[PDB]
């Protein structure tokens with residue numbers, strides 16, 4: 472029953488990058504797997520908590536749109552094993568290799584992302600770090616939401632105005648994830664990161680915080696549906712209580728998707 476994998480069964484290969492509280496590798500364990508490892512000599516009580524926190528969250532998830540947790544390892548280093556997804560993240564497709572997706576496919580990505588987030592919020596799981604980079608495209612058609620190191624039951628462009636000015640203790644909520652989803656909606660419909668004409672990071676942080684800066688919604692492409700643009704503005708509201716929850720958001724995307732191919 473237990474998910475602890477006996478040591479050395481995981482064959483660590485190519486270093487593919489870094490996630491939250493670890494370095495990610497392409498491993499081999501009963502096929503191709505993604506393994507997030509600590510590569511640190513001795514784990515801190517800080518790093519030990521962050522490990523058991525993520526594993527505890529991941530073992531509560533069983534969904535087609537959530538990155539499938541396969542197991543964990545403690546004996547060599549603190550490692551977490553998930554499924555391998557050929558084809559890079561949504562951030563990579565849109566901003567690195569500049570892949571040109573069709574509107575039908577762009578909305579399908581947004582629908583699956585909302586579908587996975589609805590599954591998390593139903594199980595009272597707040598991602599707290601939802602971004603294009605944590606949204607993974609498996610086989611170029613299936614969306615997988617990954618990296619749950621900051622989940623509770625770094626990147627500023629997806630952070631809500633409430634989150635960016637730390638008051639009070641917990642600015643993270645279901646609606647804070649909605650804003651982060653609002654930004655990935657923007658990215659899909661524009662093909663660009665928000666505030667791209669501004670180079671100063673500290674000026675963006677301050678300007679979103681005080682409520683002077685909001686994403687340029689008129690940047691969306693001409694073939695983007697009016698129902699998509701309207702939903703985008705609802706998710707990107709400065710006040711969190713004026714934002715819809717994912718049960719409502721999912722139903723909105725599913726509605727505009729059916730009256731789209733015609």
Ligand SMILES: C1=C2C=c3cc(-c4cn(C5CCNCC5)nc4-c4ccncc4)ccc3=C2N=N1
Nearest residue numbers: 488490495505507551553554555556560618619
């Ligand atoms: C276990 C994990 C394996 C894992 C892999 C990752 C991850 C990070 N990247 C890179 C990073 C740089 N940009 C391009 C994509 N790709 C993946 C990945 C690879 C295969 N399947 C799923 C995800 C992210 C988070 C986790 C994670 N969190 N817990």
